[PDB]
């Protein structure tokens, strides 16, 4: 079959050595030869497949050897085929190798780890651009064991978040376990493995999605201002040809993009000056590849975008929806009834990813947007002012704020949080976060209070002290929990909250318990309640076994919940619990 390159995808914190791993993978030299044709594309390196046998030589010793592909491109960073996640040997999984594999795991993609830094084992006697297991079997015992204790015990940190996983030579299922290769960015050891491994993983097991199609499938990784064509696009082309002229359609920072290509440039192999970039201009591009687009009408073009090509049968205005449906899929992220905060990001990927974590932070998100912030964009936030001055706050990423929007906001008051690294950006808006709940919370007597719905199997008391005995139907019933009826004046026909009092103490078979459950028990749980402030409802005359109890939930006791001494312990179904609750309550 007719197949392209697979591209490859390459994370780590450069602490494991990941941008030193690319820089030796990238290399011409190796063991008795050079790898030739190693060519940089935009936004990413491209491998000639004559440039991979020559890279993994060497691994004829172990391997039988196929080369299906045209080539290999690397991007250093599902358009990726395969991910490689370079783990350093020496310190196992860290906290962002976590995230980078809940990540992966979330997205599906598949992916190998680059088990980097074996340089460092102590007494470790390199053999340079060999092949692992070669360097490997010339080691002494020490180096072995040490190898060994450091693997096996990654291997334990692997499977404790769920993968299965194995050195990629004793790996019996390669579509399902994770494979590991041990690498060197120093030395060039492991690096044949891993090129030969990247082509055993995609060759023949992926094939269906690198047959070459005719149909364009491209990707606008970046947007940038170039010297003599104003703004252009640097995409990844998975598929297709992409030609000059082509009629090209994308997302924009204020809707759809529609132009035609100007010009197809990649980088000019050995530029006269350092400091002025000059390209090579093709007429057209075959994926797969690494392109600069120049084109009118792209300064507004957004990064993660797809890139269609309006072709004869297709209709324009139709394709035009087509690549704005990645940003209306994240406009499902809003806030529907009313309002909370506002986002801006640089990229579809960046946006994504504030939702995201602002989805779990439970913080509501007003409106979204792409691109420079403007007086506009700072007066939605305004709008906050009144009704919850918590959220006159905009969340930036990587965005310039204009000079009369920063004016502007310091003039109305509205918290502006910007950023050029995510991290950052994320951890100083929940240090924000957490002095405002430390703030406010010393106001009511009771902090947070986790939702219950109970169903009366009996009264043991009727007052001084109501004793109730129920059932819990949902949630998770706790000491100081306040429990109220909810019924209907008919008089007025208003719903009103009708307060028994708080859990001092819960026993089930007459046995002290702190907290009980949906499911916990079956026979039924003793409640002992605290008087309220004013008269307790009166059982019988006011409030009887036919009324459904709940805990008292207010706006505030929501609030309070989102802490992080409290959110941990809120499982899904008690978030969700909580909105059926507001209803109840009306709570907006």
């Known amino acids: 079959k007719d197949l392209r390159s697979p591209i490859c995808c390459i994370l780590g914190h450069v602490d494991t050595g990941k941008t030193k791993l690319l820089d030796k993978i990238r290399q011409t030299n190796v063991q008795g030869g050079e790898a030739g044709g190693i060519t940089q594309q935009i936004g990413a390196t491209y491998f000639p497949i004559d440039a991979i046998k020559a890279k993994t030589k060497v691994m004829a010793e172990y391997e039988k050897q196929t080369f299906d592909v045209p080539g290999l491109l690397v991007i250093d960073t599902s358009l990726c085929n395969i991910a490689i996640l370079v783990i350093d040997i020496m310190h196992g999984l860290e906290q962002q190798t976590i995230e980078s594999i809940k990540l992966l795991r979330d997205r599906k993609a598949p992916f190998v780890v680059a088990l980097n830094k074996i340089d460092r084992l102590y007494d470790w006697k390199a053999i340079p651009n060999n092949s692992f297991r070669d360097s490997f079997a010339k080691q002494s015992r020490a180096v072995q064991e040490e190898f060994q204790s450091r693997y096996s015990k990654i291997q334990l940190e692997l499977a404790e978040q769920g993968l299965n996983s194995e050195l990629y030579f004793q790996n019996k299922n390669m579509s399902k376990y994770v494979s590991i290769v041990p690498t060197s960015a120093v030395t060039g050891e492991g690096v044949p493995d891993l090129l030969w491994l990247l082509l055993e993983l995609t060759q023949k097991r992926m094939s269906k ?12 990784l970046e947007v940038k201002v170039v010297e003599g064509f104003g703004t252009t696009i640097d995409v990844i082309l998975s598929n297709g040809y992409l030609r000059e002229g082509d009629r090209i359609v994308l997302c924009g920072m204020n809707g759809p993009i529609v132009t035609n290509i100007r010009a197809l440039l990649t980088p000019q192999p050995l530029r006269e000056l350092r400091l002025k970039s000059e390209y090579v201009h093709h007429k057209e591009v075959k994926a797969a590849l690494g392109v600069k687009i120049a084109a009118n009408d792209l300064e507004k073009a957004v990064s993660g975008s797809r890139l269609l090509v309006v072709g004869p049968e297709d209709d324009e205005d139709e394709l035009m929806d087509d690549v704005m449906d990645d940003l ?38 007003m409106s979204i947007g792409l691109g420079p912030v403007y007086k506009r964009d700072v007066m939605k936030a305004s709008t906050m002012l009144e009704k919850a001055p918590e959220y006159a706050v905009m969340l930036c990423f990587d965005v310039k704020v204009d000079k009369e929007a920063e004016q502007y906001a310091e003039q109305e008051g509205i918290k502006i949080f910007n950023a050029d690294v995510i991290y950052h950006l994320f951890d100083s808006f929940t240090a924000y976060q957490e002095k405002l709940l430390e703030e406010r ?16 199997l009996q009264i043991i008391n009727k007052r001084g002290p109501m004793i109730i005995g129920v059932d819990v139907l949902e949630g998770t019933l706790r000491v100081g929990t306040p429990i109220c009826a909810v019924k209907t004046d008919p ?10 009092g708080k859990v001092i103490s819960l026993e089930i ?20 309640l605290e008087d309220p402030s004013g008269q307790q409802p009166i059982w019988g005359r006011h409030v009887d076994e036919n009324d459904t109890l709940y805990s008292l939930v207010s706006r505030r006791s ?20 909580l909105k059926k609750l ?6 907006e």
């Open 328 to 365: 209306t899929g994240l406009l499902d992220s809003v806030d529907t009834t009313g309002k909370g905060v506002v986002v801006q990001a640089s990229t579809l990927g960046s946006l994504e990813a504030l939702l995201d974590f602002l989805k779990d932070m439970k913080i509501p998100v």
């Open 491 to 500: 008089t007025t026909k208003e719903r009103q909250t009708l307060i028994l």
């Open 558 to 577: 929501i609030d309070t919940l989102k802490d992080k001494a409290f959110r941990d312990q809120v499982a899904r179904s008690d978030w969700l619990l």
């Open 209 to 220: 999605q690198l047959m070459y199609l005719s149909h364009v499938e491209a990707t606008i």
């Open 509 to 528: 078979n007459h046995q002290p318990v702190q907290e009980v459950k949906k499911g916990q028990t079956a026979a039924g749980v003793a409640v002992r």
């Open 582 to 587: 507001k209803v109840v309550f009306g709570i």
């Open 441 to 456: 919370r010393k106001d009511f007597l009771d902090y947070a209070i986790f939702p219950c719905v109970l169903q009366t």
